[PDB]
Design a protein around this ligand. Sequence first.
Ligand SMILES: *[C@@H]1O[C@H](CO)[C@@H](O)[C@H](O)[C@H]1NC(C)=O
Ligand SMILES: C[N+](C)(C)CCOC(N)=O
Lengths: 395, 387, 406, 425, 409
Amino acid sequence: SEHETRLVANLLENYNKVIRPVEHHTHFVDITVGLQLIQLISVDEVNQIVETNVRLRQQWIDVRLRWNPADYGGIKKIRLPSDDVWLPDLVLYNNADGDFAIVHMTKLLLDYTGKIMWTPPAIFKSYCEIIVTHFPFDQQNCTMKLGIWTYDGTKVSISPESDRPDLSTFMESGEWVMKDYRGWKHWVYYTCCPDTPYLDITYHFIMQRIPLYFVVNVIIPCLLFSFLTGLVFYLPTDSGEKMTLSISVLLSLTVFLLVIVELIPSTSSAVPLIGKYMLFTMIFVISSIIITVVVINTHHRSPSTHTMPQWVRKIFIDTIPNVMFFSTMKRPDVKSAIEGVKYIAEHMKSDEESSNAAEEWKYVAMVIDHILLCVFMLICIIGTVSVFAGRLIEL
Amino acid sequence: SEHETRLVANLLENYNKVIRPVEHHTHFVDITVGLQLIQLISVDEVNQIVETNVRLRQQWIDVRLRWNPADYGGIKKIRLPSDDVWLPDLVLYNNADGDFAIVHMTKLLLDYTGKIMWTPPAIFKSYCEIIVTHFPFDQQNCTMKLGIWTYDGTKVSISPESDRPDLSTFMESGEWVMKDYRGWKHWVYYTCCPDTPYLDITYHFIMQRIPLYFVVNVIIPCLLFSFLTGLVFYLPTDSGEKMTLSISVLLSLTVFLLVIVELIPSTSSAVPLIGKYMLFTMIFVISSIIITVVVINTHHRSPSTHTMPQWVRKIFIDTIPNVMFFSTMKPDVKSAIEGVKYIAEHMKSDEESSNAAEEWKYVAMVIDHILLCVFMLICIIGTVSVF
Amino acid sequence: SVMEDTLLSVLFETYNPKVRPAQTVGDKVTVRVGLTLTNLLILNEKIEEMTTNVFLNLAWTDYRLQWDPAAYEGIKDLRIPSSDVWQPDIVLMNNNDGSFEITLHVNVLVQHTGAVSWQPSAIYRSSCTIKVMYFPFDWQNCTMVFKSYTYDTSEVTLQHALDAKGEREVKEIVINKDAFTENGQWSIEHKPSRKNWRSDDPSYEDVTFYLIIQRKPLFYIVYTIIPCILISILAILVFYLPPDAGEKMSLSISALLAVTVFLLLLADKVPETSLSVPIIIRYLMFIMILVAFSVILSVVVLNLHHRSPNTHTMPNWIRQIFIETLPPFLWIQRPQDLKEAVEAIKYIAEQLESASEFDDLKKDWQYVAMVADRLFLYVFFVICSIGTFSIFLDASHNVPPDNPFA
Amino acid sequence: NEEERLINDLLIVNKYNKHVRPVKHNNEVVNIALSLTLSNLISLKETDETLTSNVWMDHAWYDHRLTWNASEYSDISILRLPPELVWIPDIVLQNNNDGQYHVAYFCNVLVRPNGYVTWLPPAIFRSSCPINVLYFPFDWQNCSLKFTALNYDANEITMDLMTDTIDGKDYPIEWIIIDPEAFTENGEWEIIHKPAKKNIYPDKFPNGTNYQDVTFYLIIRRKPLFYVINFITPCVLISFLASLAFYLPAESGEKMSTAISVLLAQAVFLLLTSQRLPETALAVPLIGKYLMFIMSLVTGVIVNCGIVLNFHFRTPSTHVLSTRVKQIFLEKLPRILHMSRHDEIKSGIDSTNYIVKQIKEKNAYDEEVGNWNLVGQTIDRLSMFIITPVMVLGTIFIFVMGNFNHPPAKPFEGDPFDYSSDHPR
Amino acid sequence: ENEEGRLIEKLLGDYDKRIIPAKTLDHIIDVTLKLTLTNLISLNEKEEALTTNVWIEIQWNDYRLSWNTSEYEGIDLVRIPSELLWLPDVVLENNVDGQFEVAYYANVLVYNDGSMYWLPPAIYRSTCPIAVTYFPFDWQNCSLVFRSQTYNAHEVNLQLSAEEGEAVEWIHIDPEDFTENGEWTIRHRPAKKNYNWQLTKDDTDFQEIIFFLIIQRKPLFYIINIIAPCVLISSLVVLVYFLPAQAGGQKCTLSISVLLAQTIFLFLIAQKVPETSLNVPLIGKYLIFVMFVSMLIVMNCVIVLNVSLRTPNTHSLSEKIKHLFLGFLPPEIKSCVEACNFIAKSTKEQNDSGSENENWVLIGKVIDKACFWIALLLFSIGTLAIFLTGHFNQVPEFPFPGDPRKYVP
Ligand SMILES: *[C@@H]1O[C@H](CO)[C@@H](O)[C@H](O)[C@H]1NC(C)=O
Ligand SMILES: C[N+](C)(C)CCOC(N)=O
């Protein structure tokens, strides 16, 4: 366009982009700042950084860039490079891994009244204080704090477009749910500098994690092994395989502990409930191994060296087996030949007595296993019901 | 300063930074090149890349940038942006994952006689030939080949500033120890450009690895698990746990070998001594498992289907036990009469069969004592040799 | 040449590349947008982005770049650096990184009629929403959305590119056989192109290119499915072992640990979204739960086998079910010295008879265990076969539609 | 310095336009002589299917505007100019992986008084290389670097392989140049062939930029000693342990544990192998095929050990030893497999008769149990003799088929030319 | 009309940004540094790099950019982009990457007397050599070294910032903008000017400003998620002394499995500590100790199993051994008669053999108990000592041990 060529030549012929767009140095530039969230790229819980794809809409008036439409063939709007005009130096205060300011100098829209709209894109990698205490049923609240860097509130003023960031074209995450989003403007006064207020706009988003992936991939196998933990008490000692089962459960839990500790950040501000519950399950398994070692020792107790104490006999044979209703427990040379038969009969009697005492020991071990099985099943079911305030079983 | 402003305006007025700084085109620029190693950032053994933080000191004379200090208030030195003057095009020939030339265009010191001092920083990611023969006690020798790219030796000449790189401000690595470092100048003819010689300076650093991370994390558990191999032979067959122990040791050893594999490049130039020794240890462990299975099979040999050959009885029962010293080894009444006689005959047969079974068990016991003694001999000679 | 230099001096004497070419105020520039795919590099399911090597075929008309060839020694077209002329800010809108613009700025081709064609190359990384339900037997629908970042429908009019003989529009991604590398993991099923508007925004218009790609699941089959099939076979086998062997727990627990390890290592390659569970993960969970039940029932069988009259009394229902009814169905049917010596013989005979009765009752318990174990074997074989076949038959009948719908 | 005057005359006085082709007439064509020097084969990442190379791109063309009379100036026979002051051809690597199309360092060009411009910039190129995993780790790959001219069509510039002189006759340089003074030999990959071809696609037109290219090929063979020592040997040994597990007696109680542990180790090796290859479905790798076969065979071994254990623990109380199985596994097979081999008196009489009867019944029961033991021993001996030869023959066949895999000694099957530096055509 | 326009056009007219604004030949520019930490992003142990989000405050005087406020309607402060002015090339020297300069080149505040105030933000990744001796109860002493990349001590005089006459010798932490790391606690944050006395007032490396960050790790996460499971699993070795010493007792199973779990934990620790070889981490020392102990217990289990399963066929029970381990540490009638006599004799011999085996079992049990009492003490003492010296690793009271000052505002 010839008219637009002449107009662009006239607009920038004596225009200094270093100078603020005010008619008097006393006045301030009024900038309307709107944040549009396009996509939540990631939430890095370990590194505590949230990456978002945004557009930073900024509107202000530049009276040096106005013209009469009748003098230019009726042109009312033109597109100008953002590098040609004065721009606000809007900086993300809580930047963690990206750029502080806008780096994609896209074109801007200029009206004949001097009104400018500029909506550059950005990838904001902001710091996010991750609250890993209800993982993976946690909700996150972390923000993006925007402000003019080198100008105070008396030189450049920023105001939000609306109370909330724009999520009209937001792309659904699949890992997080936007519960709430809001934008608050703040006036900050420092004791150094009473006459200069410092403006700031903070946008915050409430993210609710969708827990299905972590549930299926982590929690269910942990629950499976935790439930198999108490099954060692139904395994008879004569099988000689209790240690195999118990230790295998322990090894699986230590592998899953490795997985969990590589899942979450290493901050000690709050103890994750998943880590605490995993430690509790490990204590559970260790106590199970200890008490099943005690049971194995009791089962193989030799009657020759150990005699059953009377209290043990009373407790584990006279009163407890009656309690369990659901169990199926039970509650010349002819002389030499003569003394040979004598000896055989006497040895069989001694063998019978020793076997009876050994069977008493085995019965005591069996009763201990039944008590432990009932207790451990009850504990496991109560525990699995009461985790994450029951949100696991509710899911 | 007004004097310095006028001086800089005057120096770069008719200056053309495309031309070489020579009075006559037949002369050559002499550039004193010095390397200063600030930090050995990393040594990537798998990828064979060494990343260092260096400062590349370069000196030459530009006769076009002379001035009289008396005419400019006694100014004798100024600082100029590198982009304003002619610079040598030094290139790291063996660049691998970085920049060939200097990218940090810092300011350079210009003297009133025309002498120029320029020490830009750089991150050199050079290619390094990793010799894994003695890992993790290996020393590495890999270099930095720097030369002028587009100018031959008759136009731009480079000379080393010192015989060695400058490591005065070197940050200690914590993984490597600089044993030796030196810089050599070479005259090279390339197929591209066979008429004239191209100059280069090669800086090499002899760095010795500190073997504590890998001794603790790799070697020590490997020794712990390989020592458990000999315990299988002292374990009696009646325990029912020989195979469990031997197989667990084998699995742990193969896991550690696979971990070792991940710490070295996939090059087939040389086999690491650690890898070869782990392979030999696995071969020994598997042979021990073979002999353990043979011992277990022998211990349970039924005399009904197996009779001990004379060549076994003569050697394993009469020869070795006398040799090995440190061990502590070695009407209807007639029916009743016929029944008791049958019982006595059955005791005959059972006692004889049990005697043969005990002979087989004794053979198995002497076999695994022999193997245990062999293992102890290997362990003793190995620990004496290493010391 | 000298004449080309004269033509360039004449053309760009007052040409401003910042101004959209509109000969009269209100005119719209027609921009034809096409895409050529040279290589589908990656479809990263973890971060949900697609990396492609593409040519962006753009064509428009600039009335300011017009000349008469007869006045310039018959020059009919020029190659001009792309920065010297106005171009529309045609960018990939749904990029995953911050890269909106092209990578390679090739010369534009300007004809004497003002027609400007531009084919820059780029390495685009565009966000793709992965549907994880049928992974790894899945097909994906990855889109590339192109539009002018600056100008709206009031300033430019996006259209489809033309073919070599410029008579018909090409409403699809162009693939050149001479320059195209097959991915080897994805096969392209459909590659249509379409223009999209928004009913709530009359100034919006883009050209979207769709890549309907189907995964080739051989890698996942070989490295995950067959090993888990062997593990499930072992989990069925554990019910054929006799309880006396002492290796029932070893087999069942080893199978469980193996399948758990396979699940953990496969959790690396699957996407981390929580909208659905992939068919491979569902199969792994089914196998893991089946092996856990195998462990539980093996423990139960071992407990039954090791009972004795000194400890348990067989209830009536166990005897009725496992001794009498099931085995037919399962085909698993089964001188004072003389006086004292006489007394000693009496004692020995009584001991032998008592031991025989005790052994008979123990044998009854062991037979109950054997029958229950055989029943578990049949039940687990049936469940494993049916579940595995059902899951993989469901996964097999997942193909992209014949109509791309776009 | 007369170089300043010469450069000012060439670039400023003559009004050198950097954006115009070096042709005296618009219908002429610029000839670009192109060659590649490989200084280091940095890596070949199979998972990423990327080849990283350290190369020197050699360009040579004629610019009639950069000609001067060497006698009018001082005897200046050569000149160095930055590439941003003169016209250079934009030759790009079309099949790159990252967004790096051009060279890394824009070094000076060299100009002669007759206008012969030479440009030798270094570059790090990351190209796409499809990986043929069929014979891994005994495989060879065929990587290529395809260079196109996207700034001008085939009617405006013509790409060519650079020529060379040996005795006054010109021959094209139809290979990648390897300078012994500037080449480092990769420890993992050995270069077998390295041809260069100028390809024309007649289905396209000289109208555009897809009509021509220059491609440099690189047929490289992997050195498999590393993988043979570190991956294949432990797997083979652990696999052989499975067949050895048939020799353990059933009374030991460790047959199943041994076989299962072998299977688990094989699974670990399979997973680690999976970690090292791209997820392509063109073929299953040779080591992958061996691992799958060996895991299937070890599962068969586990099943058959379970069957042997089931047979060993049978009793007359639950099972009957039929004549068919008795004669099959106790008569025929052991020979085929060459396997080894006043009322007090009456009460006392009644009690001892009862004792004798019970002892006789116990002896018969033990005899039946021993027969079942012998049946189990025959079964697992037959199992060993059947499965261990299959195992060893399969291992040998698989790992000999891979070792008999070589590059075809001539690239471009239909072309008899060797494309080697020692015999130009 | 904005008078700033003509004022800036006057100031930057005839202004060379390449010239250090030294009024005379001997004039030395005083450059003032002040560091404001807003967020300690991370301390990457593997690469030994500290990532911080800081604002660096740089002040100097440029006599060229001074004006008379009465001539410009009282304007006494303008903002000029930093690209247009002379700057002191203050860079972070100990950076892991090549990032010497600031992330964002903000505007410079220029006062009418020539005072320049530059406050650019930066994401700095500095080298921090990590001491691993007391992992995870360790504290680190990280440093940020600032110096001029161009000018030596004869041209620029780096100094710390001073407000109210008192120099700010610490890293400033503004409550209005600061977030605690949650893993690292900042104990000391002193700042000082350092000299390299091996160099002269030339060489550009003579002087520097160093900001120190003595940060203590919070070990509660590491305790709960690594140390407690490791101790709990390692304590299981002593249970092998109560299992029966026979087939089905599973002593070696338990022992070897605990050893394997400790190996897994060693692999886990290898992922959390740097790969330097100057010291062994404390948790690594504990893991090596417990793996050695479990190996010794495997040996003891093998010996006890060998002792308990001995028979008269293979081994003879010496009287001295028995005393030591059980006295201090704990027609037809003739045939029928012959048959009965043999039956009795055979039964007696079998019973005696069983009794000898029982004696061997008892000796094994005695050895087993004694070794248990040794092993429990060994394991408990090792655990207590190692984690007690871990718990007694205090951060030094003073930022510099020689100095008596606290370096706090
Ligand atoms: C500044 O300007 C005022 C008025 O223009 C004048 O009186 C004064 O002398 C000038 N100089 C100073 C140093 O105030
Ligand atoms: C000399 N050499 C081969 C290292 C580089 C060649 O660069 C030129 N001369 O263009």
